[PDB]
Curated annotation (Swiss-Prot):
Phenotype upon changing residue 54 to V: In a colorectal adenocarcinoma sample; somatic mutation
Family: Belongs to the protein kinase superfamily. TKL Ser/Thr protein kinase family.
Gene designation per UniProt: RIPK1
Active-site residues from the entry: 128
Domain characteristics, as noted in the entry: The RIP homotypic interaction motif (RHIM) mediates interaction with the RHIM motif of RIPK1. Both motifs form a hetero-amyloid serpentine fold, stabilized by hydrophobic packing and featuring an unusual Cys-Ser ladder of alternating Ser (from RIPK1) and Cys (from RIPK3).
Disease per UniProt entry: Immunodeficiency 57 with autoinflammation: An autosomal recessive primary immunodeficiency characterized by lymphopenia and recurrent viral, bacterial, and fungal infections. Patients exhibit early-onset inflammatory bowel disease involving the upper and lower gastrointestinal tract, and develop progressive polyarthritis. Autoinflammation with episodic fever and lymphadenopathy: An autosomal dominant immunologic disorder characterized by early onset of recurrent episodes of unexplained fever, lymphadenopathy, hepatosplenomegaly, and increased levels of inflammatory cytokines and chemokines in patient serum.
Sequence ranges assigned to domain Protein kinase in this UniProt record: 11-269
UniProt superkingdom: Eukaryota
Phenotype for residue 200 to V: In a colorectal adenocarcinoma sample; somatic mutation
Sequence positions that bind ATP: 35
Protein name per UniProt: Receptor-interacting serine/threonine-protein kinase 1
Phosphoserine PTM sites in chain numbering: 14, 19, 151, 156
Compartments it resides in: Cytoplasm; Cell membrane
């Protein structure tokens, strides 16, 4: 239940693509993901600040939030060890040859809502909610993550050491945050990202494929351009299109909270989707 101090000797591994990440087989505990944050020539000393922060992160415990299983804190090697989510990210599931049924998509949306309401209920503002931070297990249940690791203050800090040998977010970023280095993220910013995730779940693709240039898209979105609702070929219930439109509202105060989305979406899910 708690964070375990693991040793590098307890594993064997393999590389992978992510915000490096390598799957690892633990000698006695089985398959895990190891994210190595620092591998260096400098024995570092503030091991406790790194360990306490992982214990503090480990306090976010919910069925829809990725669990940290352990940490490797040793001479020149610092790694986060996490549970493996076997299907990868939500975009990989959506672009797969087999199509996800509407009932399973409905459940995925509800589970994203539950995860986000839980995080906001803990005073945690995600700032990069997007399909790559939504992980999927073999049963198609989701768990929200933060692969950039911005939420872990010291682990991010430790990565930026200079004796250490070691974007795309724009589509999901709320327009107040676009072209601004100082915009502070709010719960309503995450609600905006959820609306674009909602569109992508039904379009099975990334938004704005016809955008020629990044400054064009940034200026377009700020003037009120949104993902094309007509470019959803599959059937999206009118209730979800209405919700998507309310959540990407230009005015942040018009956007609902995740608890208010849950109250509306769950009865609809149960009555209309499964
Ligand atoms: C094809 N590729 C994959 O198959 C694939 C890729 C990455 C995977 C994975 C499978 N299976 C687990 N990963 C994984 C999970 C987490 C991390 C890094 N860790 C976190 O993101 C994290 C976030 C939190 C709590 C939190 C959540 C949301 C907002 C703020 C804070 N905690 C405890 N850890 C790295 C890899």
């Amino acid at each position: 239940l708690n964070v375990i101090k693991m040793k590098s000797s307890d594993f064997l591994e393999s590389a992978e693509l992510d915000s490096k990440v390598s799957l690892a087989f633990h000698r006695t505990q089985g398959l895990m993901i190891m994210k190595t944050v620092y591998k260096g020539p400098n024995c570092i000393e503030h091991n406790e600040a790194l360990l306490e922060e992982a214990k503090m992160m480990n306090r976010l415990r919910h069925s829809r939030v990725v669990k940290l299983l352990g940490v490797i804190i040793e001479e020149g090697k610092y790694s986060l060890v996490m549970e493996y989510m076997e299907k990868g990210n939500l975009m990989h599931v959506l672009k797969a040859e087999m199509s996800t049924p509407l009932s399973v998509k409905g459940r995925i949306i509800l589970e994203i809502i539950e995860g986000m309401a839980y995080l906001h209920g803990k005073g945690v503002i995600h700032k990069d909610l997007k399909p790559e931070n939504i992980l999927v297990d073999n049963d198609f249940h989701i768990k929200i993550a933060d692969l950039g690791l911005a939420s872990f203050k010291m682990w991010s800090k430790l990565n930026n050491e200079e004796h250490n040998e070691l974007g795309g977010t724009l589509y999901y970023m709320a327009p107040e945050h676009l072209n601004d280095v100082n915009a502070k993220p709010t719960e309503k910013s995450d609600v905006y990202s959820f609306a674009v995730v909602l569109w992508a779940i039904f379009a099975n693709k990334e938004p704005y494929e016809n955008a020629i240039a990044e400054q064009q898209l940034i200026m377009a979105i700020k003037s009120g351009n949104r993902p094309d609702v007509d470019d959803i070929t599959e059937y999206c219930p009118r209730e979800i299109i209405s919700l998507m439109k309310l959540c990407w509202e230009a005015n942040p105060e018009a956007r609902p909270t995740f608890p208010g989305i849950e109250e509306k979406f769950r009865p609809f899910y149960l009555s209309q989707l499964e």
